[PDB]
A paper describes a structure:
Here, we report that a secretory baculoviral P26 suppresses melanization, a prominent insect innate immunity against pathogen invasion. P26 targets the cofactor of a prophenoloxidase-activating protease, and its inhibitory function is independent of nuclease activity.
To provide structural insights into the activity differences in 2'3'-cGAMP degradation across P26 homologs, we determined the crystal structure of P26 from HearNPV, a representative baculovirus with a single copy of secreted P26, at a resolution of 1.9 Å. Similar to other reported poxin/P26 structures, HearNPV P26 contains an N-terminal β-barrel domain and a C-terminal β-sandwich domain, and assembles into a V-shaped dimeric complex in the crystal lattice, with a putative serine protease-like active-site (S56-H110-D58) located in the N-terminal domain of each monomer and the putative nuclease active sites (H66-Y205-K215) at the interface of the two monomers. Similar to previously determined VACV poxin and AcMNPV P26 structures, a conserved H-Y-K catalytic triad for 2′3′-cGAMP hydrolysis is located in a deep cleft of the HearNPV P26 structure at the dimer interface between the N-terminal domain from one monomer and the C-terminal domain from the other. A loop substructure is present between Y205 and K215 in the HearNPV P26 structure, while these two residues are located in a single helix in the structures of VACV poxin and AcMNPV P26. To better understand the structure-function relationship of HearNPV P26, we focused on three characteristic regions identified by structural analysis: the putative serine protease-like catalytic triad (S56-H110-D58), the nuclease active-site (H66-Y205-K215), and the distinct electrostatic surface with negative or positive potentials. Mutation of the key nuclease activity residue H66 (H66A) led to complete abrogation of cGAMP hydrolysis activity. However, this mutant did not show a compromised ability to inhibit PPO activation, further confirming that the nuclease activity is independent of melanization inhibition. In contrast, simultaneous mutations of the three key residues (S56A/H110A/D58A) constituting the putative serine protease catalytic triad in P26 completely abolished the suppression of PPO activation (P < 0.0001); the H110A (P < 0.0001) and S56A (P < 0.05) point mutation also significantly impaired P26 function, while the D58A mutant had no significant influence. Notably, both S56A/H110A/D58A and H110A showed levels of cGAMP nuclease activity comparable to the WT P26.
Author numbering:
A (entry chain B): 18 to 208, 211 to 266
B (entry chain A): 19 to 208, 211 to 266
Amino acid sequence: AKSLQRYNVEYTIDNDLNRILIHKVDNRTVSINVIGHQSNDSDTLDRLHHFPGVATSVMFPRIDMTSALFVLLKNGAMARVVPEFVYTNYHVHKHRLVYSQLATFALEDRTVADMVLIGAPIFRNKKLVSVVTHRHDDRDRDAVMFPVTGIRPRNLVSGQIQFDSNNGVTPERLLTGRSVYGRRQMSYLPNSVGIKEFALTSVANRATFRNLTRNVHIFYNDDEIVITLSEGEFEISRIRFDGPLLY
Amino acid sequence: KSLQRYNVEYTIDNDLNRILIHKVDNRTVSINVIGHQSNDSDTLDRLHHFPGVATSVMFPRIDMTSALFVLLKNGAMARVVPEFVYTNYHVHKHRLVYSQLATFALEDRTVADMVLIGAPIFRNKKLVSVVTHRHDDRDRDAVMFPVTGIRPRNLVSGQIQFDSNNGVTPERLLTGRSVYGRRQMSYLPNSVGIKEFALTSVANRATFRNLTRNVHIFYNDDEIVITLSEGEFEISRIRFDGPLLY
Ligand SMILES: [Cl-]
Ligand SMILES: [Cl-]
Ligand SMILES: [Cl-]
């Protein structure tokens, strides 16, 4: 297999897995690995930059929500896209959650969207800035949405959380009439003790939960994301910011 | 005797240059402007906490385009638009409460000096928040006033429980340094340098397990980094836009 080239990127197309593999950037060998929401926990990813959905030996710089980018298509042409939307994505590697709001572009033409392969280079002023990781067919917008992973854009939030649990992180939809405390979402009144008594009881009993297994939960709806870190049932921390969550 | 404006009953305290709100919506309330560190009274525990306040009344979400009216010491009101974003925080009983907040600016310092700590802030003739902190943004040459309450859309809020009795003291992130956990360091030694420090701390994670939890807030004009650490091991970080109200 001989490598194709575009701008500062040498790559190949893998038709079995329907992916693009980047072999060189700026004239040297790189490792750019698209991760699902959960990595394989390989030690060799430890020494790479992590942004949601990717572990990369190459820095992905900050983009804004107004400048045009060019994403490489399966046929060698490129699509001009403006990442003016905001979606949140995440992955877990070795008991560390990496999450961020990310600038996100949309493709209304699903013929073009199907030509965008996992791992496809995303260019800004003829230099690689990111690669295609995840996609989400948005019902309400009737468009396929593509986050552009990399360094946190201005006006958005990113973070990381170390936890203990081996089941990883699985986001859960926040049901109507429920509020979150720690690991749990509950209605205000009992039935289940109810969120107000639970939160008060968990805080009062802080010392019994000290040093127990740390769990991270991600509660989402269309409008809001809540991320909590808990030990036992005690909520060590919470973060709240705008959805949508790419999931 | 109490003064009354819209749904609020209040008094002006001249000795302390602050406004005390006694009633909202025909009932007795407790609205307490907190510094960056509360006195840790148990009576604040059952109140709503938003940065700089503990309040028995809900402060609803505001947007950054609609007009608000802040009550002045002379009984008149200033029309303000909270179009700016600042971050504020306070600590109550080893819990940090922080949030980006919609913030208005007063360029006229004579009017700003008529805005008192605790002054009611009105939206459509109903209390929505109160004046808490202010900041002379000598860059934009205006006095900035956060409007504390529920996190506005597009902004971030959070809370972190920690152990240390010394509270949280923000620190300016110096040029050429990067943060890991409790520390900001340059990349190369002279100490150990942040790259070597972060790797060693992550490798030695189990040696810091269950040690004292500290929260640090690292800031410059453009960015705020908030970390939670046990010993030197960074449990979590969050990064978002400055400025910090401090
Ligand atoms: Cl590049
Ligand atoms: Cl981060
Ligand atoms: Cl919060």
